[PDB]
Every structure is written in structure tokens, then in C-alpha cells.
Amino acid sequence: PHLGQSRLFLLCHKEALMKRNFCVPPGASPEVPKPALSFYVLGSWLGGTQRKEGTGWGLPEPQDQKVHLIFFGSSVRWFEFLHPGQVYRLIAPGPATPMLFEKDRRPLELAGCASCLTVQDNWTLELESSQDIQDVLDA
């Protein structure tokens, strides 16, 4: 019923799908993490997080908008679906964890970057229509 959260972003740039070395996650068990098939995108958030509201979405939380969305493991399934210049709704199912789309593994090339967010395997993306985009902006 309220078992979901989402947020719109404009997809600005999509990095190649390729194996990358990942950072040693700061404060976790030290290991040499193997290269992993991965990509990431540069997005710009178009509005704040929206709670699931029955069959729809609630008002965006009041709103720097740059984000790097990081895909590995089964989230690689999104690669060919995602095109620069389009707007997508990023959806996380389940209980509304308050600061979910603020921040959280990380590619070594993005060590110490200010706004990385890992796409979880149960997260989904939907392509937004022109009217979808306007409705969020207008609220």
C-alpha cells in the first residue's frame, strides 16, 4: 500500500558495460574484490522521493541534484533499457526507508565521489512519459 519509494532522474550519460575493479568497502571485511561486470550512469534528480500511494505515487519531498547510479550483479539487466536523454523513475519496493535515495559497493574509478548510489537487485526502472515528467515538476 505504502510499500514502495521512487524518484525521477534525467539520464545524462551512460558508461560502458565492462568489468571494473571495486573499492574495499570502508569499514567492511578487507578482501581483494574481483573485477565485476558493471556500469554506471550520471543522472540528475528531477524531484524529491515519492512514497507509494495505492496504485500511484505521493508528492515529491521538498528539493545538488547530480547522482552516479551504480549497476552490478543482476542490476546489469537494465543496461540496454537505459538511454541518455530520457527520464526514468527509480523504484525501491518495500518499507519506506527515510533517506533511501540519498546514499548507500563502488567502482575504484569513483573512489571518494560525493553522490554515489548503488542500484539494488530488487530496484526497478520505468521510462517516464512527457506528462509523467510535468506532473512531478509541477508539484
**Residue 68 or 89: which CB sits closer to Hg ion?**
68
Element (H, E) at 132: helix 130-138
**Residue 3 or 127: which CB sits closer to Hg ion?**
3
Residues that bind Hg ion (CB under 5 A): 15, 53, 68, 113, 115-116
85 CB contacts (<8 Å, ≥6 apart)? 10, 11
* Cβ contact 7:90 at 8 Å: yes
Q: Residue 124 Cβ, how far from Hg ion at the closest point, in Å?
A: 20
Residue with cell 540496454: 80
**Residue 11 or 116: which CB sits closer to Hg ion?**
116
**Residue 53 or 104: which CB sits closer to Hg ion?**
53
Nearest CA among 70, 80, 130 for reference residue 106: 70
Residue 97, helix vs strand vs coil: coil
Q: Residue 51 Cβ, how far from Hg ion at the closest point, in Å?
A: 7
